[PDB]
Amino acid sequence: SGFLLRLAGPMQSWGEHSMFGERDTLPYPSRSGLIGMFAAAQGVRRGDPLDRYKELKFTVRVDRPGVRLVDFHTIGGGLPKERTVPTAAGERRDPKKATIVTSRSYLADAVFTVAVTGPEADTIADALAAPYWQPYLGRRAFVPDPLLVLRRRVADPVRELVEAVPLPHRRVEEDAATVLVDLIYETRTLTVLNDVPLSFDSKSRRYSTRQIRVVPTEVPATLVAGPGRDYQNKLFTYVKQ
């Protein structure tokens, strides 16, 4: 069982621990987000039991860490006072203060290839191919790369993360081999953060911590693609086989 999910695209955000106007992303995908991505693909209404998703495992290798950028993002500004965001008391604030100013962060030009291994993950892959709601990378405005699922069915996909999945253009030294790539596994634990989603109900979303261990591993330098456009070519060669 298992399939390869490729998270790529111009921008993707995987925030955790932010609860005000400023938003912040983890430099790598968060299990909560990917689980919600599958739940959205399967029609799981907000508030439905998320234990079906329990028992999955997410090893994620970071091809390009990507640049982290902060996207300004106002809400309601430049509108007449009557048509701005409501207050909790119900009376709209004065128009010179009715604007909301959020500073949301997002990863741009970053690409990870998570190898999801679970009990029903093959039905989940078959659900991403025909989604109930549009899958997106973190914020809904970010739209996933068309090669969202590199392979629908793979026996031992981590074995395919160690090798035989192409890689972006990187420095390849003379007489070099085995270019270093950071794999992320789920003592030797990088960080602890609230990921595993106890409930997605918008009224009270709650989570619990998951330790992450990031192990730099060594994959053959043959894997990295040539400088220009070759990455797309090798990747497409990869999807048909």
Binding site: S18, F20, D24, R68, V70, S105, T189, V192
Partner: protein, 244 residues
């Protein structure tokens, strides 16, 4: 407490239904002796205040818990963590955690974050089990942390001073955001000795690795405004300070 709360219960006791938040004191009193936990700071006029949380340092996950590898240090840590204390081995496996709530001192609030130190940094020291490559790892890591922070303040003050001068600040926010975002992988490359630009594996110290990231973030931020010669002169005067 300066704040006084009363929570109206639900009949079963399962939930709170109403709440009353209100003052308990009209006259404020100086609380004697500085709080051990917080990191303090003295500012011209000699007034002593706790260093405010900054959500930009939370961009690089768990940077404050690296406090142990260190000028000014919290007193509780400085009593219990060091070697004058009394435990024997305990200190080897203790690891620090910090809770920070960056917000306005008024009613605005921005960001909170927890931060336990990574267990990989000390465990990478014990994989080897030798007196020297280990003390060298620890020395490197302590050294890396010192470089990242010194140039973090150098870059804050750089952007802050330049922005004020150029108009005769918003540059600080993006400066620090870009700084820790770029300064995070170079640190992890210096610890593993992997090759990071501005660093040569096996060098005795950070090697200017950090000074390069700060310059790239600063030049990333002040980039579009170094056009006019008057403003370019100011911006150059203050990037030159990051040269070390």
């Amino acid at each position: 407490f300066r704040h006084a709360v009363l929570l109206h219960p639900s009949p079963d006791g399962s939930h709170v239904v109403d709440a009353w938040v209100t003052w308990a004191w009209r006259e404020r009193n100086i609380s004697p002796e500085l709080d051990p936990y917080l990191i303090y700071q003295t500012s011209k006029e000699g007034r002593v205040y706790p260093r405010p949380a900054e959500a930009e340092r939370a961009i690089w996950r768990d940077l404050d818990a690296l406090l142990h590898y260190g000028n000014y240090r919290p007193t509780i840590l400085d009593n219990c963590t060091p070697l004058a204390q009394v435990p024997q081995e305990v200190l080897d496996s203790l690891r620090l955690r910090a809770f920070g709530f960056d917000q306005d001192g008024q009613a605005r609030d921005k960001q909170w974050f927890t931060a336990t130190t990574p267990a990989v940094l000390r465990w990478l020291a014990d994989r080897e089990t030798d007196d020297n490559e280990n003390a060298r790892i620890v020395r490197r890591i302590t050294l890396a942390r010192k470089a990242a922070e010194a140039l973090g303040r150098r870059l804050e003050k750089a952007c802050k001073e330049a922005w004020k001068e150029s108009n005769s600040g918003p540059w600080v926010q993006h400066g620090m955001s870009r700084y820790w975002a770029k300064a995070e992988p170079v640190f992890w490359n210096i610890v593993y000795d992997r090759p990071a630009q501005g660093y040569t594996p096996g060098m005795a110290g950070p090697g200017n690795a950090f000074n390069l990231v700060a310059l790239a973030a600063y030049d990333e931020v002040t980039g579009p405004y170094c056009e006019r010669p008057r403003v370019a002169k100011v911006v150059e005067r203050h990037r030159s300070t990051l040269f070390s």
